A paper describes a structure:
CGS is a transferase and acts in the committed step (the fifth overall) of the biosynthesis of l-methionine. MetB is covalently linked to the cofactor pyridoxal phosphate (PLP), similar to other members of the aspartate aminotransferase (AAT-I) superfamily of enzymes. Similar to other CGS enzymes, MetB forms a homotetramer, with each individual homodimer creating two active sites. Here, we present two structures of the cystathionine γ-synthase MetB from M. ulcerans covalently linked to PLP and bound to the buffer molecule HEPES.
The crystal structure of CGS from M. ulcerans is presented covalently linked to the cofactor pyridoxal phosphate (PLP). PLP binds tightly to Lys208 with a covalent-bond length ranging between 1.3 and 1.4 Å. A similar series of sulfates are found in the MetB–PLP structure; however, there is no evidence for the presence of HEPES or any other ligand bound in the four active sites. The only noted change is seen in a loop consisting of residues 350–362, in which the disordered loop in the MetB–PLP structure becomes partially ordered in the MetB–PLP–HEPES structure. 4-succinyl-l-homoserine, l-cysteine, l-cystathionine, succinate and combinations of products and reactants proved unsuccessful, showing only the presence of the PLP covalently bound in the active site.
Residue numbers in the entry:
A (entry chain C): 12 to 350, 362 to 388
B (entry chain D): 11 to 352, 357 to 387
C (entry chain A): 12 to 352, 355 to 388
D (entry chain B): 10 to 351, 357 to 388
Amino acid sequence: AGLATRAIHSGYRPDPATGAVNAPIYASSTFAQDGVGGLRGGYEYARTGNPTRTALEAALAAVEDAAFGRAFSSGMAAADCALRAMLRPGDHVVIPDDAYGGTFRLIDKVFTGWNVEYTPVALADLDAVRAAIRPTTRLIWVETPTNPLLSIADIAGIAQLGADSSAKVLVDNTFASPALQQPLSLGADVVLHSTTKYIGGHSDVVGGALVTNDEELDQSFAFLQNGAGAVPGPFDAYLTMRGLKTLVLRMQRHSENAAAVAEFLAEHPAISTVLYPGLPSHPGHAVAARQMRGFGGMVSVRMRAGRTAAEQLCAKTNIFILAESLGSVESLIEHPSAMVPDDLVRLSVGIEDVADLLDDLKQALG
Amino acid sequence: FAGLATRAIHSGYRPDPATGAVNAPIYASSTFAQDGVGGLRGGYEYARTGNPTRTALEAALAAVEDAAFGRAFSSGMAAADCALRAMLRPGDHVVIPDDAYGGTFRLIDKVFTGWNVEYTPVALADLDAVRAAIRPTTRLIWVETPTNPLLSIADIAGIAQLGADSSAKVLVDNTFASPALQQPLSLGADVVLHSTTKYIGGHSDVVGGALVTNDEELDQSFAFLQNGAGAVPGPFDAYLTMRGLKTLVLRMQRHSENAAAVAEFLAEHPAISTVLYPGLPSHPGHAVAARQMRGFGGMVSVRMRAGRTAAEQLCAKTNIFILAESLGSVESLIEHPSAMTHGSQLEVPDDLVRLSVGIEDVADLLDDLKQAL
Amino acid sequence: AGLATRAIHSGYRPDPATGAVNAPIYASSTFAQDGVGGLRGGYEYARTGNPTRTALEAALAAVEDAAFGRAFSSGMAAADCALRAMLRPGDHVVIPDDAYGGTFRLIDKVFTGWNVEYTPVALADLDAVRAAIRPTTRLIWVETPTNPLLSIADIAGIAQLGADSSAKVLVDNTFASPALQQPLSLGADVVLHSTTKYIGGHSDVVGGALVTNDEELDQSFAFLQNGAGAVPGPFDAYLTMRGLKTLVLRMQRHSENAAAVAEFLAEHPAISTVLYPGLPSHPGHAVAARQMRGFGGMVSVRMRAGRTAAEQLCAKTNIFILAESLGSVESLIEHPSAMTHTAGSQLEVPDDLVRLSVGIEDVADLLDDLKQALG
Amino acid sequence: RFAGLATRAIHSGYRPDPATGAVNAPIYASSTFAQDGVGGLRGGYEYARTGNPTRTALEAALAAVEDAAFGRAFSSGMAAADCALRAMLRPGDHVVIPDDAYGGTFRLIDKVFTGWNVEYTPVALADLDAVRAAIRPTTRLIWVETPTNPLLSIADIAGIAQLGADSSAKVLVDNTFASPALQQPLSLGADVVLHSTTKYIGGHSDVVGGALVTNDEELDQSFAFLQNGAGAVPGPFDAYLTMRGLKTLVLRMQRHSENAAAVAEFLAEHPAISTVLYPGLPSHPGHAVAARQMRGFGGMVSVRMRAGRTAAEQLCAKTNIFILAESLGSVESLIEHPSAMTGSQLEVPDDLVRLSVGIEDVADLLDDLKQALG
Ligand code: NA
């Protein structure tokens, strides 16, 4: 029933042969068959399907209340599979005007070379999103909150627009995670995760996922999953599943720490603007409150005194680690314009003691 | 650093300065602390883009192909996908084998054709036919030798020259021969692909692929899609692949010796009509194979005189050869391609059985085949 | 500063060479040297010491405010090191009368063979613990809360006894974990963990730990760690470090869930007694409140209808998993009398008793699960 | 499954999974196992320390390769050793040991077990009269290594087996150096065999582990008790690497022997070297015993340096392919100076260099030594 219970129990059942409570790590690329009966348990070749990956996919689908899940070697590999499944030459995709840099690079630098067209739009503006839809638009790419601005898109709003013009709607739910948002229950066709971030939760596994309720779409994902082979190894799939078992607990403490950080930096005179979906003054706050169970562990701030203040905050923290990525138990900090306005610093607030995080920020700010 | 066994062990990772660790550590870190914004440690910033275990692996792979550049991927097919997309755009054409690896044929035909890439399959053994397949739009010639499962041979130098002459790149998928038996960059290939799943890993426990090249520009174009599409290996698997590669040379020698003994036995056996093995003087392309390969490999295929039934029975009744997909493993494997794999390619005969001969004691392998037959 | 912060940051600093934020898994048994004995970072052979294990030891030490940490292949291996380091033939150990079955079996079955004597005692009775001390008593073996009865021992109180008689005091701090109890701040000489339980947290790594401030005792431990070689591999060490990083967060939820499960069972008519340190009426509650930051994730209950009802509860849960071990994110249930061997030297585990390791699943679910399972 | 040793090492430890057909033993990272009703075990598994599926597969593999009925794996060679000694000895008992034992074995016996009132006597194992004369009424164990570290001296396993039978004393052989691929001590009357699987069996210097195998079901049960009771148990990833390494043991050992024989030949002709120790050399003390009981003469060569301790140090410093590091039995060549690295034991001469010859191309290893010797 509950999501924490599902993250722990839903996708791997203790083995019949040994009772092993955890999905074993099947470091096998191939599988014995029976000359009369053929495959055992449907397994033939690891790329196509393997037991550990099946467990992961079953858990990923479970926590998004999806019928189907697919796991990939990276969040970008999931995005690549989604783009390639749902677009062809001559098609168009609407994208966010502030999407994840890797997504933008992929679409602008790769897919445009393969005769896919795209228009970025401020997703908060539903009339703007609708105007950006052409006869050739097959796909609407939604991110919410966005990386790094934490801007909000009305998933339900956009799904309606998708339905109205026969465009599919994908929601990249990395930041929010299954613990905070369920885009399928709001109308999305497909949900994408970089499991590298919150689901893994420990900065130790690169991975990705696609989940959906649409069986034809799942089969189209599977075709590219097997065919172009951007698939996770079993130790990594195991680590991902491991992380997922604590996601709900973790995202609660991320969100509580992140509110405390945003409140501190709201009052701190070096900071001009705090970007956090929990704040009533944040644009999109109301939309966030309706579609999110909690407001996430991400906080971005714009520094009063500009780029140089931003660089110096990033270099002076002793708990927040200056590094790319986000969604880890250890707080991370970066300067996105370098690594977006150049005075913006992005904070992935971890699960450390809050008094420590607030003291680290105070001393770093001077 | 001079011989290939030596390089395979020593070239890919030097013992750590800070600890002296003799093996590449498994860096299960997705990200990497910086000193000031963009003050990278050792060039590392985000594991998809680059990471220390995968760098070690890429060094080892480049070294055993005597290549300046190596790229590792989550699978052989991810390596194929990256190459195709790096070297082709809509409108372009690729010459491929008429008996290509099935996953390669499926990707080009069922995926890339819908991205306005065109192809022509050819008997690669016939250089006039290969030449005649090249269009003004041909940017790529895709070579596999030996091919799967007929073990047909292509003249990698002869095909390099046809590529040079029409400004098409030549990729050689060297999975079957491995770096131990065949070095296609030395013969004029632009790029070599492996499935490291097979012989390089050698133990049927890590899926992975590789691209290697001496062309800096081409390496940069693969890097772009490596990072961009993120079909990247994890560090445990990258480690397994490297560990696998440290015995490649030794394993392949025993693989070839065992395969030659199996080929010999099956050539004398009443139930077999045809033995396909690159080392037999009567194998088509044997003399090419002899010129470009150091040994003739661990794959043997046969056609059963009594047809599909005989082939099915053999695969069912082995007790040491394992009925399974894949090849290149220390344990012998057996497949009936017509039953176990899925106009434009050659039809694999339904009386054909493919043997991946492993490193077991040869007497036991021969006795297994004898009783199975 | 804060313990959750320390669990995250204290025992591995991001790598100078690469910045890697996590302790790399160094699968190397050996280490290159710069001319003979020119060691690199002090490494020479994995069993003696290796980088991943050093990181784990540094984390383990940090979370208990200990200067020294040593990791082993299991909690039992940590226990065997501790006993072999601190005892010799003819020495004696005072032990809990309801100790963890593995500790008792190792002492009663193996060490008695090697001429070490023991006396079990009710650790809650400080006069009885003191009475059990002989001139040959070199060690007092404290466990709190106990497995499976959850009895409480006054650590500071026992530590004073050890000091008075020159006997070292070890606390098996497994159940409580570092998040809830800090025995070295209370006078223990050594703290033991099975990191197989709460610290790993995910039932996926078997491991043990001995932490201490006494550099001489740590060197005795190191001698046996190296010499008898019950050492963890580096993937396992990494998993244990990984679990540790969310211990503080998880223990909080185990303790909340467990409070709820205990109150629930306490009013259920199938249950005759609830054993939970948090309950005011639990013997040792005031002692536990003094020394523990929270009351833990374990609850044991006695069934009004006897052994058969206990077996039927264990068989009927669909969320609690019927399996040994404890301190996992998944709720585990068991019937401990069925794994006990003891008569006369250890308290009898009642056959109507069910032990529950309450996980971090949604509490409503877990209560629904007990409710349907009880009938 | 089943005939030749290379076949067994591949096929005997795990049959492909009935549920999935997985060709390799899965890594079961589970400390516990669900039951069907209380005591209703699945496959007999209940708690990983006591038994777990990946360890079971490794123990089957280890047993099969020594033609043993019973296998036990441990977290290191030294944990295998500590288990053996605690299983077979009690205070007041005595063990006869080699006078040039592996340094860890000697340290555990002399520095740990003497304090638990176990006594020992070191003896030249090659001299069967001296082994015999070392045996007391309290002698319950004779501890045999052959070849010995690092002098590569030989002991007559069968002959020492008969001395043990004569005096009701169990015989254990540390078969680490020879490995199952070259020496089968149970076939020669040993009661138990021990390995550091860290060395040849794993092969790749990437997994610490040990093993005890036996045909004696009673002995196995005494080891099981302490495996479980003391818990020096391997993790399942490490167990997996050990099983994977074992899959190429027979193949690697053949090369290691060929490479080492050539390294011995080269060194014997080289004027910087006064003595070459290699079991395969006709003039090696114990060569005909070694020829009798070993299928090949192994990967280890030790040499003494004419110019003494300093030339030993210099050779160890100057190799570029042989890596200066402890341990042995790796696909990469290793070199060490045991007197610096590693009256109750034979002094290892300070001029001695121990070479663990790997599977690199022989011509590169000879060139490496030739340039390092100057
Ligand atoms: Na665990």
